[PDB]
Amino acid sequence: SLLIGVATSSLALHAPSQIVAAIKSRADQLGASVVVSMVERSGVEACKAAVHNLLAQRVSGLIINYPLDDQDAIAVEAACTNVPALFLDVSDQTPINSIIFSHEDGTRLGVEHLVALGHQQIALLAGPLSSVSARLRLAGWHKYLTRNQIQPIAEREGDWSAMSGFQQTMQMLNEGIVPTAMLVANDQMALGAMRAITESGLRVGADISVVGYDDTEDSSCYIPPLTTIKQDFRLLGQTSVDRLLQLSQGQAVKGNQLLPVSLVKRKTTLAPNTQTASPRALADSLMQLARQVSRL
C-alpha cells in the first residue's frame, strides 16, 4: 500500500542489508511497500540523486539509511519535496526526523566492559572517518576511555569490511603495537582483526580481546564467538516504518529518537594477558619446527 522509498548505503555491508530487510519485514505487516535505491557511496550528491529517483517512483515517504554529515543531512532532507523523510544514519543533533541507536551507551558498554575486566592497553579501530556514526563511536570510545582515565595506545580506521580489520590490525601489530584489547567499529572488521591476530600467532580472548559493534547475524558464530554491541535492526526497522507511516499520515512526531543498544558478551573477551612467550619458548618451538623441517 504505502510505498516506502529507501536510500540505502552499499548492501555489501551486512548491517544495511539487515536494516533494509527489516524495513521490508515490517512494511509487509502494515501492508505497505518498499522500493530500494542504492546510493553511489559519495556523499550528498550521490545520496541526493538517489532520493530524486525515489520521488519519481510515486514514493509516499522516504527512509534514508545513508551516512550524512549535518550540513548534508539538512540538504538531502530539503530535497525531499514535502515527502516525509526519516534519516537512519545521522547525528542525534540534526534538526530532521531521525531514529538512531544510542552511540553513548554503545561506546560506554564497550569501554566499561574492557575496563571492568582489567584492560589498560587498548586500541581503537574506527570505521571510515567519512561516516557520521564511525566518528560518533570513535568519540564515545574517547569520552569514556579518558573518563576511566585510559588513553588508547593505537587508533586507526578501516572501511567497515572484514579485510579492513585484517589490513589495519596486521599493520598495527607489525608496528609492534600489541594492545591487550581492541574496540572495533563493527563486527565485520572485527572478524578481520581476529583473523589478523591469529595470523600473528596470538590468541583472541587469551592474548588480545576484541569487542565488535552491531551484532550482525553471523557473529554468534565467528571463532571465537564475537562479544559485541547489539543494535536491533529489527527494531530500527519497525520503528522507522511505523514512524515514516505516522509522519506520512500527518502524525507529527518531528524530532530525533534514540534506540536502546546492548552488550552481548561472548568469547573474544577475557582480561588481560599478563604474560607472553619468552625467547626461550620461541626458540624451543623453533627447535621442533627445525627438526620437522629436517625430517622432510
- Which residues would be at the binding site for ligand IPT (CB under 6 A)? 9, 13, 15-16, 19, 65, 67, 88-89, 131, 133, 160, 186, 213-214
CB of 109 to ligand IPT, least distance (A): 14
Cell digits of residue 65: 539509511
Q: Which is nearer to a second copy, 111 or 236 (CB)?
A: 236
User: Is residue 91 within 8 Å of 257, Cβ to Cβ?
Assistant: no
Distance of alpha carbon 221 from alpha carbon 95, whole angstroms: 39
CB of 163 to ligand IPT, least distance (A): 14
Q: Which is nearer to a second copy, 8 or 107 (CB)?
A: 8
152 binds ligand EMC per the rule CB under 6 A: no
Which residue from 153, 264, 267, 271 is in contact with ligand EMC, where contact means CB under 6 A? 264
Binding partner of residue 89 among a second copy, ligand EMC, ligand IPT, none, CB cut-off 5 to 8 Å per kind: ligand IPT
141 binds ligand EMC per the rule CB under 6 A: no
CB of 18 to ligand IPT, least distance (A): 9
Distance of alpha carbon 89 from alpha carbon 133, whole angstroms: 7
Distance of alpha carbon 23 from alpha carbon 19, whole angstroms: 6
Binding partner of residue 160 among a second copy, ligand IPT, ligand EMC, none, CB cut-off 5 to 8 Å per kind: ligand IPT
203 binds a second copy per the rule CB under 8 A: yes
45 binds a second copy per the rule CB under 8 A: no
Distance of alpha carbon 8 from alpha carbon 101, whole angstroms: 17
163 binds ligand EMC per the rule CB under 6 A: yes
DSSP state, 71?
H
CB-side exposure of 258: number of CA atoms within 13 Å? 12
Distance of alpha carbon 225 from alpha carbon 214, whole angstroms: 14
Binding partner of residue 214 among ligand EMC, ligand IPT, a second copy, none, CB cut-off 5 to 8 Å per kind: ligand IPT
Three-state helix/strand/coil letters over 146-183: HHCCCCCCEEEECCCCHHHHHHHHHHHHHCCCCCCEEE
Cell digits of residue 281: 619458548
CB of 101 to ligand IPT, least distance (A): 7
CB of 165 to ligand EMC, least distance (A): 8
Question: 279 to each of 21, 203, 282, 286, how far by Cα in Å?
Answer: 52, 18, 5, 10
**Most distant pair of Cα atoms in the chain: their distance:** 79
79 binds a second copy per the rule CB under 8 A: no
174 binds a second copy per the rule CB under 8 A: yes
User: Is residue 165 within 8 Å of 190, Cβ to Cβ?
Assistant: yes
Q: Which is nearer to ligand IPT, 131 or 209 (CB)?
A: 131
Residues interacting with ligand EMC, by CB under 6 A? 162-163, 166, 192, 195, 215, 217, 220-221, 225, 264
